[PDB]
């Protein structure tokens, strides 16, 4: 699949399991249209969000529901979610891995783009 | 001055100067209302966005125009913009410092909340 | 293998390939004894550094040769290397993945510890 | 004041206060000679480590005692200490700010070099 997300928990030193995420794609009217969603597995990875055919060029937003993740663990974090907004496939099809590293008051995201 | 934003450049090891950003507050209808904006100084900091009486509890979004920063340096980056979305909370400390560390394909944000 | 290292390049949005690293283990005399070494593959990963039998309890240092990596790409970075120093296996055998994210003037390391 | 160190706590969203650190300078025999030390203030900063005339070009190591910080909070961390190893260079800017962001199983350091 051309879009995968992996999430780590910097407090536990573990993959962040059951992190919900919603992907949106900017529509012609400049609105965010729902594109795909899912939750991380026990490996902290979310595979199978989309297909090469459906993952056309556009501007995508991956909302990672970090507040819902920390609150499900009984922790009150700072951010509502982590957002990753990027243009995809504008030079032809690519594979995107979006990594995220979570702490209650800090996070880091990184993209690995392969052809 | 209850809200400050500081932006650093991880490629050059410098403050990120002249970085534009807009702050929004979430309205009752779930839309983002413009709240404040500015661009970072020679120290990479943006002061004076708001005041204590105006900065009431609620959900805020800081949208940092990282793509324009990198393009002005002749570098093509991954993200359209860096986003920091959070709830302001009176039960906690009263000063919010949002820091963002920028790289072309990665960005980490941290919140430092002090009294 | 119970110790793996993965390295990403935040400038290119790519696995950091051919990053050399040297692992040391603290000896009884408080010196750092050479334990294992290798370089990242095209996936940015270094597998096979050690075995369950040889990876005994102790204090280990993973030196990641980030300067040698950036200089081989014609970039002058800030750090000499990235160091990761940790006690391993003190509660019994574990598997350790050490992740590192590199920029010329900044890096981040993260440990995933599994049983 | 050519060298300052700032330490932040990513779990609590605060300066990391009372964090001890030692700075070493690499000697001609490749050993680490003690150079300066101190502990972070209520702002998470350590000022006054050295002076311009003493801080000559060479390789320096800042060893930050992160393990003691986390244990004082009742948290068991991964790393023995955070290490920042770098060459001071006169050709570049003259002020060095080393920042470290701490989480139990992860830590990111950045250098901000300004004039």
Swiss-Prot record, chains A, B, C, D:
GO terms for molecular function: hormone activity; hormone binding; identical protein binding; molecular sequestering activity; protein-containing complex binding. Changing residue 110 to M: In Chicago variant. Changing residue 51 to A: In AMYLD1; amyloid polyneuropathy and cardiomyopathy. Changing residue 46 to P: In AMYLD1; amyloid polyneuropathy. This is Transthyretin. The modification Sulfocysteine is found at residue 1. Its main location: secreted. Changing residue 50 to K: In AMYLD1; amyloid cardiomyopathy. It comes from Homo sapiens (Human). Changing residue 78 to M: Loss of tetramerization. Glycans are attached at residue 89. Thyroid hormone-binding protein. Probably transports thyroxine from the bloodstream to the brain. Belongs to the transthyretin family.
